[model samples]
Every structure is written in C-alpha cells, then in structure tokens.
Target: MNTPKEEFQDWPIVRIAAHLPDLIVYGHFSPERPFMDYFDGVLMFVDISGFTAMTEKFSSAMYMDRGAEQLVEILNYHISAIVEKVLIFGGDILKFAGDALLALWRVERKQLKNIITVVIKCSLEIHGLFETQEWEEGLDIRVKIGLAAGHISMLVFGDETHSHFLVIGQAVDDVRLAQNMAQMNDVILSPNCWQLCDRSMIEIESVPDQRAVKVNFLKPPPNFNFDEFFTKCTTFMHYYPSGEHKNLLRLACTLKPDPELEMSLQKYVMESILKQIDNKQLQGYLSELRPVTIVFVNLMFEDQDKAEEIGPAIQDAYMHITSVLKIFQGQINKVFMFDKGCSFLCVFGFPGEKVPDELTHALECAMDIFDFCSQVHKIQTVSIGVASGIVFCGIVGHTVRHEYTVIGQKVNLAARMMMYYPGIVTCDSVTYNGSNLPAYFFKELPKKVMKGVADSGPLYQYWGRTEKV
Candidate 1:
C-alpha cells in the first residue's frame, strides 16, 4: 500500500475553501454564528439547455487530448463569466451542478420592492451575455434562467472535525421547477416574485405565467440612477477594499473544520477516483469526458419524525450500501445526504481503463442496494435509476469550495427517473441493451418521461438477475 494521506490543516485560512462556501468565510471573520442560519434571498438557477448533445458532439470527433482541453475551457469560459456577474450584482454561488449553476442573493423582506428590480436586472445582464455569444464548432450554447425569492436556510451538521454545510428550503424546489419551464435565452421568475416587481417591465408578449419585467427596454428617465440599485441587497463574500491582511490571517486560524471533514468527505469519493488520484498524471486525469454506466439511489422518506431520525437512517444506509459496492469492487461516485434521506450516485467505467463487465457489476450492486432499502419499508422508501452515457467527471468549484462531481443529461436521467417512480428500479434503454440481458430479465415501460425530466428513450425494469456469469 503506497498511501500517505495528505495533510491540509497546516494550510493558511485564505487557503481553505474546498467545501466551505464564500459566505462562511466572512461569518467566521466577523466573530461568531450559529450552526444553522436562515436568510431571505433570491435563488437563481441557470443551465445550458443543450449541453449533453454539445459535449457529446465535441468529444466524438476531436482527438482525446484536444477534446478535453476544449471541454474544460468552454465550461470555465461560460461558468466563470456567470460567477463574475453574480459577484458584481451582490450574489454568492450556491454550488455548481456540473454545467449548470445555482446562485443566492440575500435581500431584506422590507426591501422587496427594490430587491426585486435588482435581481431581475442582474438576470437580464446575464442573459444578454449569452445572447451576444458565438457557438463553437456548430455547438449551440443556449442558456436559460429561473428565479425564485423566499426563505433560504443554511444548516451545518456535525462536529468541528467533519462538519458539513447544507442549503435547503421550499424555494429550492420552486426555482428548479421554474427553471425547467424556462425557454432558452429567457429569464423566468416565480409567481411570488412576479407579484413584487412593477408591472411596466413586462415585455407585453410575456416571459411566462410567471414573468414580470423589472424595467422596460430602451426607455429610462434621466433621474433613474443605476448606482442606487446596487445597494438593494448585501453579500457574504468578503471584499476588503482597504486590504486588511491581519484580520484575514486571524480568521484563517478560526475556521469551522480542522480538515478532518475533508477526509470524511473523501469517504463518498469512489475508489476509481482514488485510483486516478493516485495515478502519476494527477491533474491530467480530470480533463477528459467518460462514457460509463451510472447507478442512482434515492431514499425519499415517507412523512414522519425525521428531525432526528434521518441522521442515523443515512449512517446505517451508508454502511450497508458500501458493503454491497465493496463486493463487486464498484465505485461510490457521490453520496448527497440531505435532510430527507440521501442519494447515492455511482459510476461504472473510468476512461483509459475498461472493465468488460461494467454493466453486470453495476446492475448487481444496484439490485443489492434496492433489496437493502426494502428492509426499511415506510421509514426509508428507496428508488433506484440507472443509465449509461458520456459525462464530464472532474473536480468543479472555486478554490474556496471544490467538489469532484459527475454531471450530464444522462446523470439527470438517472436522478429524475428515480425521483419519478418511487420505490422501484428503472433504467434507460442504453443500460438495458448494453447489459446484454435476455428479454425475460427486463419488462418494457412507457417511453414518455416525466414533465421537464427529459425526452427519454425506451425504459426497462430489471426483473431479476440469475447466477453470476
């Protein structure tokens, strides 16, 4: 075993950002805060409408090395631009959903009249940036935006060693739905948001049943001061204009986690990731896209007293699920344990190396995970979705916070379909055919997918697996 665990605790305060959000940095610097905090703000969801096809087309023709360079560059070009406008307009990024993005802008309830215009203007400027853009190699980079304003809860769980940060609220759901409904190159607002802003800004042709223009196009009075709108909301990102280095140095020593949580966080990283981590190339491993089998497991708990029960429910699930994966030598790509239950996203094939039996191995582990969850009944109802396709698997996040994430349309298929049919196992046709299983092993299902989920292909349900091949 040639493993020497890396150490990060000795790093300076300004250096730690892998899992911590930008907001937490300022909070710690100011003095103190609670484990959980709530803010009234607007959550924006911005996504590329045709990214899957774009990435697939881009990777197919170009040489592997050349394709990867373009892929990573294009993502950074578009995303860093979004990050720029978010900061300029007083917003902080929530997290990067692969090619997609989530941003938060804190606003006081009493200032909604002005706050509404500020966020809307921010969205307009972001949308305009994409509109003026050009496509690459015939790839269409269509963008869509969705906005929702309401309660934003920032909750932290665990001790100083392995503490974790989470953002949750009903508004989280609203933003996603509105985002799904938005057309390409348009910014859609929620019904609640539309009610607050002035009606004159509407484009007359509508942006949606949920659209209200914050300002008119091509018309503004001389008295309208753009500078006045900038103060509508405050941001948590520290921008010390006068360059105060001493205080930042002091705050760096007082951060929440001693970096143990980073290792605990590594518990969810798949062995395949570890293999590449150990590989000599190191940073070079993340550049390329991978076409692999995906397994999605979601524990959508039934209504009950989850306030305290959810924690151990996930802990128990983690122990049992990891056991199944260890048997097949499978990889645990990501495990997102939310307040509800938890979702485990697993990957099968890594680039350069091919496991001929990747399909069967994943199906076996998936079936085992499904059977394991059945033991809990109502307490932990589980749903499993599997699909196979190409996706960019790499480390994504600002230096303050980085996540080695797997994201693509197929990954969304696995997640959305699993969320579609609760307590069942359904996979896309790609997984079924690549599986090379007999017809008797799988039953046919309707091809039509849930609204805004995807324009899915044939669907199949795994009946059962015979003896190991």
Candidate 2:
C-alpha cells in the first residue's frame, strides 16, 4: 500500500487513533504481545459492509485485494480524523483490518456520545467513498460492525514474534453480531452502550411488530381489516395438554377465532386426559428439560398472492413445538419460517440448571418431522430454525382466559427470525450461541436490520449445512 501522509508506517496509528475519544487506548504492534492484552477499554468493530457481495462479484482474488485497498484508504481518512478527536479527548485507536477497523473508547461515560458521533460520522464517510462502486463497479461493498466493552486479555503464540489481543468476556460476540446486523447507513448501538455512557444519547427505535407472512388459503377474520389484524396478530399460540391444567389451553387457543379455536381446545382437552396417564408412567424418566425442534413443512404454492402462505403452517408448527416444551414446562423462543416449506423453530435449554442436550434432540425432531411432512402430499418438504435463549416460562392472560407459556423477547425474536432466511433449516444468532450444534453445519450470514423490527440492535443469520456422513 502507498501512503500519501508523512511518516506513514507509524501514521496508521496516528490516523486511526485520531478520532477515538479519551475512552480508548490506541497503538500498533504485533497482535500478539503483553501490551496488546493490557485492558481498560471497550472494543468496537467496523467491518467492510459488503465483503460477501464483493466476493460474489469479483471472486476472492485480485478484486478482493483491490477492494481491500479502497477500504484501507477510506479507513485511513476517517480513522485519522477520529484519532485527532481521541487525542483531544484523551483516547486511542487500537487496530485496523484490511476491510475492517477496531478501536477503543475509554470507560468514560460522558464522552461516549462524542465517540459514537465520530464513529458514526466516520463510517458514513467511509461508506460514501464506495457508493458509485458499491452499486456500479460491482464491488457491492457494504459494511457490518459489532461493538462491546470489557477487559482485554493478550495471548502469546509461537515464540515472542506472534501474539495478539484476545478479548474474553460476557456477550461480546452477541454485541458484535448486533452491530454487524445493522443495515447500511444506519447507526446501531447496544443498550449496554447507553448504560456505559450513563447518559441517553440518541433515541433508539423499538422494533415494530412484524406481520411476517400472508396466508391466502385461510379465510380472513370477520372484520377483514388487513392492517389492523396484521399488527395485532404478529404472534400466535396453539393449545397443548397442560398437565392437570385445563383452562390454560382454552386461553392460548383464544388468540385464534373463538369458535374455531374452541374446537381445537376440545380436542386438546381430550388429549390432556390421556397425557396424564402417560406422564404418570414416564414420570421417573421424563425430565423437565426437553430439547426439541418443531418442523412445519408446507408445499410451495404457485400463487404469488399467497403472501401469507406461511400463516397456516405456523399454527401446526407451534403445536408440535409446544408439545415438546410442555414436557419440561418450557416454551419456544423464536420461530423462523424460511423461503421453502422449511418453517420450524426449536426450543432448547429449558427448565433446568444448564442447557440440555438440544443438538441431538433437534436432529431427532427434524428427522421425525421431515418424514411426517414428506409423507403428506400437500406438504412437499421441510426446513427448520433452531435456537435456545432465556425463556420466560409462565402463563399470561386475563384471569378468565390465562394460559401457561414462555414469554421472553429472545424466544419470540428467535421464533420470528426464521422468515429472514432464503432456504430451509436456518438458525438465529441466539440459537447458534445457545445450541450445541457442530460448527461445520452452520455458517455466519451477513447481519441485517430485520423487517418491521425497529430495535437498532443486531441479530445474526445462520444457514444449516448438510451433515457430512
């Protein structure tokens, strides 16, 4: 790389650190070094927005290198500006990636806004440099970033020449994934960041309720007010045998049409009676934690009008999921319905001291559902979304129509996250983090600002890989 600045070799540090406020420590050395590990600042990650898109266009060769060069040049400009801000505010810039950058803002709470302002402004500047090429040059350069704060730990490898900073702590990856998930030209800051600053910065937008799918085959509600119904019915519930409990099923069923849902409730009640008998016999072996995946398979329809085609499948899918969750008094967190007839969300790590053996169970449930759905002519195939997160296991509703169910945000987020995937058998950020699946079977998806969701928070996308036999 050629540099236009004076003392450029050492200048990467100066330019990079210039914008960071006093809250960060900036330096340059081997990634592996005791000094690198010395902590006391928060780590912020800024990656090339569209590296994957760029690769698709140019293949990962000369194009990638040249693309990286552009990124470096742009980063140099903004980072240098940030470095100047940092010095004035007493902070530093840590490092830079060919298409990404990492810096730190000290622990000072008040200065965070200024730090964020500089980072956001710099990122915008960086993004604009590639605007024409982003769309025209086929570079398709879009950046995704993640940021988190914690103590730094340095690790040494191969003699003394190779070593680098290794940050180890709570929810670091989660926070990073959050950043990477934000859309292009958007500012994504975690709730924690606000807490760190101990001052409200920008007004973060709350994710709106998403009417994820459209179901054409099913009749619309009596009112037929499309917009009104969608906003109110984003999530749904299905009734299952609730141990000795009786009314809970009715309440959960009430989310649907009263008369129609009543019929389902009647059947559920009959099933519940039989369930107690089975439970008594298996009580000794039945554990409170059940790791299961509910696969909702449906055939692809020819009609483009059936935008809500996934709606009907979601009910049955939830049914199968609740059947398993009921075993441990747990519930589903997220239900991801993919493009193909692959709509199922897994519920794992429930009602227990620790996460259970969900991977094995998830695989088992997947195979079973696939067989069942495949046998039905109307349902051509199956795909799945599996994840585990904090599940608020409890029942909520009016006194007359209350029911038992899990109501945690992660649960719903993971459940609905299924709609974002292109193919079947997907997973959300939370599921990957909490599940015990083999890494080879999954790969990171570009972060995204999900539809109808307003939280500027980040979320990860995952695609399931075929198992290597």
Candidate 3:
C-alpha cells in the first residue's frame, strides 16, 4: 500500500534526512524544544608553554610598538592552524581558554578504537604544527597538552533569545588537572586515555623516576617523505626547516606507517581541490563560575614591641599554616604582607576539582590553624574568616601579568571578616550552617555590621576542645 508517508518522501523532510552530513545526533533536533544527552569521547587540552612570559615580554615592548602586532599575528596563526587540524579529524573545537584549546572527539561505540587513533593523530599533528612553525621575529613557541577519554554530560541551555552548550562532569576537570601536571613541551595522557591508544604508533617515555608516562609523535606520515613534504611546505612558504633529520628519516624509512594519516592527507587534498573553507569563530576567554570556600588568615602582633620579630614570625606561621592548608587540599590564593602583619588568603574547591564538603574542609583547616598558633612561639595572634559562595575562578589581569584568581563578593566578605576578629576563627552563617562539624564546636556570635556588609548575618566562632568561652 502506498501510504501517505511514502507520498511525502519527496517532500523537504525526507530529502533533508537523505542528504544529511555524516555526523552523530544524540536526540531529535526540534526547533520546538531543546535537548541534550551524554557524549562519551576523548578530550584534549593544549596550551602554549611559557605563555605568561611571552605575553609579559610582548606587552612590555608595546610602548614603542615593537612586538605587539607580531604577538597578535603569531597567536592568531597558531590558533587557526590548531582549529584546522582538530576539525579535519572529526573533533569538536569545544572552546578556547585564554591561551589554550579544548577539543573533543566522539564516535560510535563500535568505532571507539578508531576514534582514539584519530584523536592521537590529530594531537600529534597539532603538536607538530607548533613544533615546526617559525614565528615572526625570534619568538620561540612551545606547547603543553593533556588528553583524557571518558563520558561527559552535554548540556544545552537556552531560551528563544540564545543558546549555550556546556560539557560537564568529573572528566572535564580530570583533563584540566592532567594539563596542569603536564611538563613543558610534553603531552600527558590520563591512565584511561593511555589504555585505549595503540601505543606502538607513538613513542612513549616514562618520567625519569616515576610511573608516569608521556607520549610524543616522532614518525612521519606514510608516503610522507620527510625530505619531500618538508621540502614542499618549506619551499612553498620560503622558510628553512631545521631539526634532527637523520633520526626522523631512520624511523620513517624503517616501518609501515598508520593508514589513517594517508586517508586524512587524501581528504585534505580533495577538500582543497573542491574549495577552501574557514569556519573559525573567535570566542572570548573561557572561565567557569564555581562555588568555593574562601579562608582568610591574618597573622599580626598585638604590641609594637613585637615589630622587630615580624619576619621570623611570618616564616614560622606560614610553614605551619601551609601544612594545614595542604592537608585539606586547599590552594593558597595570595599572601599579603603589611607593615605590621601578614595575611594569607587560601581557597578550597578550585583550580583542580570541587569537593562536596568544601565548607567543612575550610572550617577544619581554620581550627587547625588556631591549634598551630597555640603550640608555636612568636606567632600566636591569628584570625581566620571563612565564607562560601560562587566566584569567578580563572585567569585575570592584563596579558603581561595575569594569574588564576578567585574574585567575588564572598572573597571580600571573607577578607573583611578577618579584620573583625583578631585571635580566633570567624565565619558567616552560610559557611557555619553548611559545615557538618559538631554544633558544640561553634559558638553563635551576635549579628554585627561589617565593612561592605550592611547586615552581617549570624556569625560563628570556632571553640575547639581547648577554648572554654
């Protein structure tokens, strides 16, 4: 029977489906509503090595307008090349984080092995683009990369006005942390990612004295005569390529290379034959808003007679305080030194991973600080303020001197609360209520007006086992 559906096959809906591109669609794409699903794939994080130093030097030269233009040109060039390689290998150019790139590759469950190979191929080529390129003037560029393969929640959030895509899960954080652990000019892969790779295709080297393994691409593509392709690219661009060619030739000359490279190069040639395409989108620096606990410690002296002892006091205080912070997996945001005292701003649940009980951890660290002060000498006057809230935790400042900082109202409140207390631990009700510590351990302090806080909410004073009242 010729059904109505068969009659409508000639219509736009069926025709569109017939000619659709070879891509994965998680669920139905309806303009009526938004939807998302989990995407299991391999993720890559790559960033320029010594990017801070490079920016600092170039920005410093801008007064005379020396390397500013050159710097911008170099960055754009590298980014463009990276995007090209990533897209060509069926990977998604997720987003750009300041000076780094996050890329993802996914395929059918049956094709997981093939997808891993493609990701490794793309990573090697991306590294090669940076390794072989000659920048303007004498700027030497190096990159560090980290890769992990796992499941991530692909979230779609938007209304009629606009839409946003967010890739979330512990896997995302895992890749970022692995990137942090990556050494300069190296590619560090998580154990899960490493387990999936065809290790023989690439050279793997373990750390000098550790179980850690790093991977790098040393062999050229199949039928890619190092002398031939290098000569071609170099000659066309009027540039001379220099490196250890003997070892490169020895490896390429000895083995049958991976077939994936040949297919990719063929596709590249065919695409160039048809037409060139540029689909690069310039997105601003990526920074995620996250909840964190800010712990502020003020190390000060009560009397002017102790002014001469400030230096030694800070040294001793920092040593013990740092130990406590580390024990709780907290990161030191900053340490400010004043004429009469010093202050330490430590953050929990950021720059790596978020903890479920961050407030509890921060409070525990604060109590330990009080204990350390009592037992130590020359530095007993310690005050701590704990606050929990959302903050922008990412790189901030000009290109010359930027750093990863946690800045927000909560950070300020924590800092202000420290000034109100001189020799004990103080925290807002938000942190106090969220903590799982015993109720008797904390004493409720009267609500008072604090600087920048109109009506300071219920505050808590940590009265550990030793403190009576």
Which candidate should be chosen as best, given TM-score against the real structure?
1
Q: What would the TM-scores of all predictions be?
A: 0.73, 0.32, 0.41
Off by over 4 Å in 3: 1-36, 49-53, 61-70, 132-140, 158-162, 207-212, 216-469
In lDDT terms, how accurate is model 2?
A: 0.37
Q: Tens-digit lDDT track for model 3 on 1-469?
A: 8555312213222211111111211223433222346657777887653442344355453436434344444455555666666654555555443245677765444444445656666777777776665544343566777777766655433334322333555456556666766765677776666766656456777655533457756453466453343333332211111354322211112213334322222221112111211123221222334677888888766431232344445555666676787677776655543223556678777323334366777787888887676565666467888888765544332221123445556776787777876678988877877776678888897666774455567788877655574
lDDT of 1 by residue, 22-130 (tens): 5554544211112456677787888754553455555666555677567666666665566667656766666665246777766677666566566677888887777
Clash-forming residue pairs, model 1? 13-252, 17-400, 17-401, 18-401, 201-213
lDDT comparing candidate 1 with the true structure: 0.60
lDDT of 3 at 130: 60
Can you tell me which runs of candidate 2 are displaced by over 4 Å? 1-38, 49-93, 97-99, 107-137, 150-158, 198-200, 207-469
Judge candidate 3 at residue 53 and give its lDDT: 31
Top lDDT hit: 1
lDDT of all predictions: 0.60, 0.37, 0.55
lDDT of 2 by residue, 1-469 (tens): 8766532222222222222211222122343222223443445565543442232333235554353334333333443443343222222334332234454544443444444444333444444544554344443455554545444333222122111122333323334545645665444555454344222223344323421111112233355553453223222111221344333312222232334323322221213222432353341222111233332222332321122333333334444445554554333322211223332333444334344355445544544444444444334444444455433332112222212223233433444444554335555554455556676656666666664334524433333345431
Could you tell me the TM-score of candidate 3?
0.41
Error of 2 at 135 (Å): 5.0
